[PDB]
Amino acid sequence: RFTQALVIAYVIGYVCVYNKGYQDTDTVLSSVTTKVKGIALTKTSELGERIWDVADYIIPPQEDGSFFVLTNMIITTNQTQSKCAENPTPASTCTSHRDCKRGFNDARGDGVRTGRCVSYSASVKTCEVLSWCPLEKIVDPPNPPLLADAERFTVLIKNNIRYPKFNFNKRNILPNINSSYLTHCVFSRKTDPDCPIFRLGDIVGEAEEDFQIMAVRGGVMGVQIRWDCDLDMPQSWCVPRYTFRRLDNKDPDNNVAPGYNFRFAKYYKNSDGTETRTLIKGYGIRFDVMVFGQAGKFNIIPTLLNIGAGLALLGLVNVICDWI
Amino acid sequence: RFTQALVIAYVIGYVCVYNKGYQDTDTVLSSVTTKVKGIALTKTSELGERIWDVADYIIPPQEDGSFFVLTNMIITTNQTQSKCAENPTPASTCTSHRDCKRGFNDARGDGVRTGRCVSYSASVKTCEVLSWCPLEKIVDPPNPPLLADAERFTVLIKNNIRYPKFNFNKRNILPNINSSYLTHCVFSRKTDPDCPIFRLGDIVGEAEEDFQIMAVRGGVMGVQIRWDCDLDMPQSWCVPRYTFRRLDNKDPDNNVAPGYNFRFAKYYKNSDGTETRTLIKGYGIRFDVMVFGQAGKFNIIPTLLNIGAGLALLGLVNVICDWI
Amino acid sequence: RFTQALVIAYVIGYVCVYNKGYQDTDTVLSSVTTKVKGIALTKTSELGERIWDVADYIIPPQEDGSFFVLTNMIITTNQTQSKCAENPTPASTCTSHRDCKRGFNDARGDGVRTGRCVSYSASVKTCEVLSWCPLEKIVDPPNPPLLADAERFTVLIKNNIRYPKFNFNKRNILPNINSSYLTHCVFSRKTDPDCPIFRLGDIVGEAEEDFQIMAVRGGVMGVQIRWDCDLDMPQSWCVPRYTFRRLDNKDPDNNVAPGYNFRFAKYYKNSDGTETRTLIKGYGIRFDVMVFGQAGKFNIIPTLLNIGAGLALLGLVNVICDWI
Ligand SMILES: *[C@@H]1O[C@H](CO)[C@@H](O[C@@H]2O[C@H](CO)[C@@H](O[C@@H]3O[C@H](CO[C@H]4O[C@H](CO)[C@@H](O)[C@H](O)[C@@H]4O)[C@@H](O)[C@H](O[C@H]4O[C@H](CO)[C@@H](O)[C@H](O[C@H]5O[C@H](CO)[C@@H](O)[C@H](O)[C@@H]5O)[C@@H]4O)[C@@H]3O)[C@H](O)[C@H]2NC(C)=O)[C@H](O)[C@H]1NC(C)=O
Ligand SMILES: *[C@@H]1O[C@H](CO)[C@@H](O[C@@H]2O[C@H](CO)[C@@H](O[C@@H]3O[C@H](CO[C@H]4O[C@H](CO)[C@@H](O)[C@H](O)[C@@H]4O)[C@@H](O)[C@H](O[C@H]4O[C@H](CO)[C@@H](O)[C@H](O[C@H]5O[C@H](CO)[C@@H](O)[C@H](O)[C@@H]5O)[C@@H]4O)[C@@H]3O)[C@H](O)[C@H]2NC(C)=O)[C@H](O)[C@H]1NC(C)=O
Ligand SMILES: *[C@@H]1O[C@H](CO)[C@@H](O[C@@H]2O[C@H](CO)[C@@H](O[C@@H]3O[C@H](CO[C@H]4O[C@H](CO)[C@@H](O)[C@H](O)[C@@H]4O)[C@@H](O)[C@H](O[C@H]4O[C@H](CO)[C@@H](O)[C@H](O[C@H]5O[C@H](CO)[C@@H](O)[C@H](O)[C@@H]5O)[C@@H]4O)[C@@H]3O)[C@H](O)[C@H]2NC(C)=O)[C@H](O)[C@H]1NC(C)=O
Ligand SMILES: Nc1ncnc2c1ncn2[C@@H]1O[C@H](COP(=O)(O)OP(=O)(O)OP(=O)(O)O)[C@@H](O)[C@H]1O
Numbered sequence: 013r014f015t016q017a018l019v020i021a022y023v024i025g026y027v028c029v030y031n032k033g034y035q036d037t038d039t040v041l042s043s044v045t046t047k048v049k050g051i052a053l054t055k056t057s058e059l060g061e062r063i064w065d066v067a068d069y070i071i072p073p074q075e076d077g078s079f080f081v082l083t084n085m086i087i088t089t090n091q092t093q094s095k096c097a098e099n100p101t102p103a104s105t106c107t108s109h110r111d112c113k114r115g116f117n118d119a120r121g122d123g124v125r126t127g128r129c130v131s132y133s134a135s136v137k138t139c140e141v142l143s144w145c146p147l148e149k150i151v152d153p154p155n156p157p158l159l160a161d162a163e164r165f166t167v168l169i170k171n172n173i174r175y176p177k178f179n180f181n182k183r184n185i186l187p188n189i190n191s192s193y194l195t196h197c198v199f200s201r202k203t204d205p206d207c208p209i210f211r212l213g214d215i216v217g218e219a220e221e222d223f224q225i226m227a228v229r230g231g232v233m234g235v236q237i238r239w240d241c242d243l244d245m246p247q248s249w250c251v252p253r254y255t256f257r258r259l260d261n262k263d264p265d266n267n268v269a270p271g272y273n274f275r276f277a278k279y280y281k282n283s284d285g286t287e288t289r290t291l292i293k294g295y296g297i298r299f300d301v302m303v304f305g306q307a308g309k310f311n312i313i314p315t316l317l318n319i320g321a322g323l324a325l326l327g328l329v330n331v332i333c334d335w336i
Numbered sequence: 337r338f339t340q341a342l343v344i345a346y347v348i349g350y351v352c353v354y355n356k357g358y359q360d361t362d363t364v365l366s367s368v369t370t371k372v373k374g375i376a377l378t379k380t381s382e383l384g385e386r387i388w389d390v391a392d393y394i395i396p397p398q399e400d401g402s403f404f405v406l407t408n409m410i411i412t413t414n415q416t417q418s419k420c421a422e423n424p425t426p427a428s429t430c431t432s433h434r435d436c437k438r439g440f441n442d443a444r445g446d447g448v449r450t451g452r453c454v455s456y457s458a459s460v461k462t463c464e465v466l467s468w469c470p471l472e473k474i475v476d477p478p479n480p481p482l483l484a485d486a487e488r489f490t491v492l493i494k495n496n497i498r499y500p501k502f503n504f505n506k507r508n509i510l511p512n513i514n515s516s517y518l519t520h521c522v523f524s525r526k527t528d529p530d531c532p533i534f535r536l537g538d539i540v541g542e543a544e545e546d547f548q549i550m551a552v553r554g555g556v557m558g559v560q561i562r563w564d565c566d567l568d569m570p571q572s573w574c575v576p577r578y579t580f581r582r583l584d585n586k587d588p589d590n591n592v593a594p595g596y597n598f599r600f601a602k603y604y605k606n607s608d609g610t611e612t613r614t615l616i617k618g619y620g621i622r623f624d625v626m627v628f629g630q631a632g633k634f635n636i637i638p639t640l641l642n643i644g645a646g647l648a649l650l651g652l653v654n655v656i657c658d659w660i
Numbered sequence: 661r662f663t664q665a666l667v668i669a670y671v672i673g674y675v676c677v678y679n680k681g682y683q684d685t686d687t688v689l690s691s692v693t694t695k696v697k698g699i700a701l702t703k704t705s706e707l708g709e710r711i712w713d714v715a716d717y718i719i720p721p722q723e724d725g726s727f728f729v730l731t732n733m734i735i736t737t738n739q740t741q742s743k744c745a746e747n748p749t750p751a752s753t754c755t756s757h758r759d760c761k762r763g764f765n766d767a768r769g770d771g772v773r774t775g776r777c778v779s780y781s782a783s784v785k786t787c788e789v790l791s792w793c794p795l796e797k798i799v800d801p802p803n804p805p806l807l808a809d810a811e812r813f814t815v816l817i818k819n820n821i822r823y824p825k826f827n828f829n830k831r832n833i834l835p836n837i838n839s840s841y842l843t844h845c846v847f848s849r850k851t852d853p854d855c856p857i858f859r860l861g862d863i864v865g866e867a868e869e870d871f872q873i874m875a876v877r878g879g880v881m882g883v884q885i886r887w888d889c890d891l892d893m894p895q896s897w898c899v900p901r902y903t904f905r906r907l908d909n910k911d912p913d914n915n916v917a918p919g920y921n922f923r924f925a926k927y928y929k930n931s932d933g934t935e936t937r938t939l940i941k942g943y944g945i946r947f948d949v950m951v952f953g954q955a956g957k958f959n960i961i962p963t964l965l966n967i968g969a970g971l972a973l974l975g976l977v978n979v980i981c982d983w984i
């Protein structure tokens with residue numbers, strides 16, 4: 013009896029109301045584009061005093077569902093194909109030319125050996141290599157990071173979605189939004205919740221992380237957009253909701269392999285018309301954009317079927333009381 | 337009785353025949369590469385008369401499951417790190433130097449302020465900034481778009497797929513295809529259905545969109561390849577099928593944030609050996625390639641099980657007639 | 661009876677033990693970054709003797725969940741916007757200027773026609789085009805491939821994962837790993853199984869492919885990381901496991917459209933300050949990184965429910981013996 017009304021009454025509240033078994037259900041089809049805005053100033057030793065704008069700090073300019081913002085750098089300029097001593101190291105140090113085999117090439121080395129053992133300094137000798145010389149100096153990335161200004165950068169995240177079963181289209185620029193608003197707004201939980209232009213600092217902060225710390229060696233940030241919509245309700249709900257998680261750093265006890273960095277270059281031709289290269293070991297945050305969602309709507313079919321299933325238990329409650 | 341043969345007869349037609357419950361079922365593993373071919377000519381004011389080929393208009397050259405084709409541009413050439421007046425704007429206009437705080441930097445501004453209030457023109461003064469100068473002029477993207485020729489571009493979409501349960505491998509270059517055919521063919525529903533080289537114009541047109549309109553501010557195009565295969569049938573069916581949808585523009589009543597654009601640059605060293613930069617605000621279409629599919633095959637197990645389930649209803653039709 | 665203990669005993673072994681129906685179950689959230697290390701030497705005709713390092717051979721430097729390594733190249737240098745004869749071809753050959761319509765532009769041609777019919781050689785005439793000239797010569801990619809050294813390249817694959825239900829975080833740099841180890845280790849099934857730095861050669865070899873063959877025209881390699889974890893066991897299991905599959909080449913009987921290649925360029929300004937371009941048709945392997953996994957953990961609920969379901973068959977074994 014209590015078991016009866018408990019079950020019969022349960023299949024309603026539990027499955028039909030709470031779990032909305034009366035609803036037909038779709039998953040979201042999503043597309044996103046992003047644009048980052050902001051300007052960093054750096055004075056280093058020595059490229060001098062320099063600005064970095066969007067075309068400088070987003071590598072590459074375009075990716076589908078993510079963007080990478082440069083935070084820190086180690087820059088080696090005026091490289092050319094030439095010979096130079098490798099950086100001092102147990103595998104690179106030498107005394108005799110015989111230590112360095114010509115043509116010797118190992119994945120972790122600075123180039124292809126000549127092989128001569130040559131002075132890296134007055135204190136130390138190293139195997140000569142054919143490489144892009146000068147080699148990158150061995151040093152820790154600058155703290156504070158050169159691109160600290162990037163905490164204040166903003167990103168417009170534009171997101172189109174559709175729910176095919178329901179022929180329902182929407183965009184995360186809401187209908188109450190307009191051009192002006194985007195001329196000024198920056199997303200805020202309190203004053204600007206419908207602004208899809210987020211401050212990078214706020215993104216990482218809301219994930220309980222410190223941009224300036226994280227900017228030194230770089231990292232990976234998730235931006236999640238959940239579109240969960242009961243289409244029985246007005247189309248005015250069915251708004252995106254935003255969470256921010258840090259993706260990397262899943263074993264913080266390690267000092268092993270922190271952050272995110274990669275190398276890239278800018279090539280030039282010089283007077284003689286021979287190539288020279290600027291190599292950057294860049295550190296930054298990859299912002300990864302992830303869209304999920306499920307739309308429900310009322311349908312009789314799932315209702316019925318779920319009731320057919322529902323009573324199956326309703327009868328064999330008391331039937332099973334005897335069935336033992 | 338009618339309910340009997342209706343159910344007993346139903347679990348067969350409905351689930352076993354229509355819904356193929358007698359089949360073991362896999363989902364597709366997919367991989368795609370793409371190559372775009374074509375050449376655009378532009379005469380602008382003034383880079384002059386210029387061609388754009390694949391290495392000019394695909395940014396970047398390589399992405400996994402998508403490609404971006406440049407359609408329109410705003411190009412600012414001969415930039416260097418220097419000082420210049422910001423573009424006229426409620427936030428940038430000034431009268432007194434005191435209006436412009438040195439070091440002032442806001443995400444939406446043209447650079448880092450000096451701050452001096454200087455002439456932007458004879459009519460107007462603006463805060464000076466350290467930036468890449470000259471700044472980009474404020475203007476609408478060219479209509480017609482500079483890259484209109486891109487409607488006639490073609491893209492080879494090569495797609496490998498496998499169904500691991502069934503050890504079934506296939507490629508969207510069909511076995512009846514050959515090298516010559518690819519030397520000439522362009523996909524057509526009527527004459528060239530097995531040509532996997534699609535004209536961009538036809539892609540967007542088939543999605544009921546107008547390439548030249550869409551090329552002005554850019555946009556996002558879905559290309560869907562469904563591989564749905566009943567492996568009971570000959571391996572000669574199990575061909576890919578193509579649909580084309582536009583992904584963005586999901587709230588067309590808005591004038592807010594149309595299309596797709598991003599900024600990127602080309603760096604050079606000049607006489608003095610100081611950097612100069614060409615900044616492009618590029619507009620284009622992102623073509624996004626999406627592969628789905630499910631392979632069925634005959635298996636007795638799903639048959640049996642689905643019958644065990646099937647009769648469960650068959651008996652309690654008439655049993656439930658009494659059960660009330 | 662045998663059917664009884666067979667079923668009753670079955671729902672335990674089969675579903676609860678083998679299929680672990682007593683477990684709550686999550687799917688993995690994953691993130692990966694990669695870094696490739698190594699240096700190739702090339703002597704070609706004629707860019708001369710040249711090294712290629714990470715900034716030379718990874719195009720682009722950064723992608724989410726994949727990386728592309730250059731293996732072979734065809735390089736055309738000193739291109740500028742100018743006129744030249746198209747490469748000899750049934751569609752490009754001519755006798756009369758009248759064969760070449762000015763402005764004529766077809767997706768598969770070398771440029772925009774002048775149109776004049778001009779000498780491509782002493783033997784042959786071809787339509788003149790406005791293009792980036794000189795055009796790329798028509799030739800087979802070098803065998804052996806210029807970048808054969810890339811077989812010996814290494815890639816650090818760093819992978820963070822979480823299982824939200826279980827609040828479980830881990831990284832594929834295991835807790836028994838340290839900095840030194842990464843200073844030296846390369847992944848080996850036998851001696852270095854916890855080294856997440858893989859030799860490209862070993863990746864393709866383990867997929868039963870030949871790097872040097874595959875390097876000529878390029879290809880696509882899958883790297884799969886399965887994290888399947890029974891969290892009832894110690895967190896010390898729940899290690900990633902690695903498989904390596906080749907993704908493309910799913911119809912090897914074809915000579916049609918082998919491998920992976922794309923075109924890209926490097927732009928320069930010359931003396932006069934007019935653009936010149938190096939065009940590379942690059943061939944290489946796309947390494948695609950794929951992370952899957954399911955974590956189980958003990959929960960009473962799934963246990964109970966699965967028993968409720970389990971006995972449903974247990975009773976109607978002997979009940980159904982009569983039910984016919
Ligand atoms: C384009 O799209 C924009 C975003 O949707 C629109 O902005 C919105 O405009 C409406 C009305 O114009 C704003 O309405 C709110 O009304 C509240 C009460 O108004 C009342 O005041 C009267 C006093 O005489 C009273 O008699 C009546 O009751 C009357 O209705 C205001 O209190 C509220 O203002 C503030 O409160 C919010 C905090 O909860 C905060 O969100 C607001 O933020 C906005 O302004 C601050 C600066 O003050 C900016 O920093 C933000 O960027 C933001 O612009 C504000 O603090 C407000 O007046 C509504 O707030 C507003 N939304 C936002 C967030 O802007 C534009 O109207 C649209 N433009 C066009 C042409 O349609
Ligand atoms: C490489 O791969 C290619 C693509 O699979 C192959 O092309 C295919 O070649 C076959 C046979 O060579 C073509 O066969 C068709 O046969 C039809 C009837 O043929 C009959 O004609 C005889 C007359 O004496 C008759 O006695 C017999 O009955 C004989 O069998 C033709 O009508 C058909 O031609 C046209 O009809 C199609 C419209 O429905 C259309 O698809 C065709 O398109 C092709 O040609 C046009 C130019 O005309 C091009 O613009 C297209 O790109 C395309 O090439 C055509 O309009 C056809 O002859 C078969 O059509 C053809 N498929 C295609 C699409 O090319 C090559 O044979 C392969 N090469 C090698 C070496 O194996
Ligand atoms: C940082 O992280 C590293 C990786 O986890 C650690 O390396 C590991 O260090 C442990 C102990 O230091 C190694 O332990 C193994 O112990 C075996 C038996 O040891 C026994 O020998 C004694 C003899 O007197 C005996 O009395 C005791 O029983 C004692 O315990 C060794 O046989 C084994 O060595 C070899 O066998 C393995 C083959 O199955 C092979 O994996 C090992 O590979 C390592 O060394 C080769 C060169 O020999 C390198 O090429 C590899 O890169 C690798 O470094 C080796 O062939 C071993 O001594 C354990 O093997 C080791 N793991 C690896 C793979 O390095 C470091 O200890 C950590 N560093 C710090 C500071 O904590
Ligand atoms: N990262 C960002 N931070 C702040 N504002 C932005 C950002 N991205 C875009 N906006 C602003 O939002 C509005 C719509 O952006 P959209 O990129 O569609 O237009 P746009 O004309 O290309 O923008 P812009 O030329 O200013 O980059 C514009 O007014 C634009 O300036």
Ligand SMILES: Nc1ncnc2c1ncn2[C@@H]1O[C@H](COP(=O)(O)OP(=O)(O)OP(=O)(O)O)[C@@H](O)[C@H]1O
Nearest residue numbers: 371372373490491492518519533767768917918921
């Ligand atoms: N976007 C495209 N439009 C038209 N034809 C194409 C396109 N992409 C490739 N093809 C042609 O399809 C065939 C196979 O392409 P694939 O790229 O595998 O060969 P390829 O020799 O690298 O081609 P190519 O050197 O002409 O770019 C070639 O004949 C190629 O010219």
Ligand SMILES: Nc1ncnc2c1ncn2[C@@H]1O[C@H](COP(=O)(O)OP(=O)(O)OP(=O)(O)O)[C@@H](O)[C@H]1O
Nearest residue numbers: 119120269270273695696697814815816842843857
């Ligand atoms: N592809 C690779 N092959 C071999 N070793 C690598 C590779 N990638 C990284 N390593 C080594 O693994 C360790 C951690 O890599 P990580 O990139 O996090 O550090 P890093 O200081 O940026 O490395 P590096 O400056 O040497 O590229 C470093 O010692 C690094 O040299």
Ligand SMILES: *[C@@H]1O[C@H](CO)[C@@H](O)[C@H](O)[C@H]1NC(C)=O
Nearest residue numbers: 089090091092094145288609
């Ligand atoms: C560039 O190259 C020369 C040697 O080739 C070097 O001495 C000079 O300092 C470099 N200049 C720059 C750009 O720093």
Ligand SMILES: *[C@@H]1O[C@H](CO)[C@@H](O)[C@H](O)[C@H]1NC(C)=O
Nearest residue numbers: 413414415416418469612933
């Ligand atoms: C480049 O720079 C100078 C000033 O630095 C400018 O006057 C000149 O017009 C520019 N030339 C080009 C490439 O348009």
Ligand SMILES: *[C@@H]1O[C@H](CO)[C@@H](O)[C@H](O)[C@H]1NC(C)=O
Nearest residue numbers: 285737738739740742793936
């Ligand atoms: C570059 O251009 C000229 C013609 O513009 C050509 O004759 C010369 O050989 C080229 N030089 C190079 C870089 O090979």
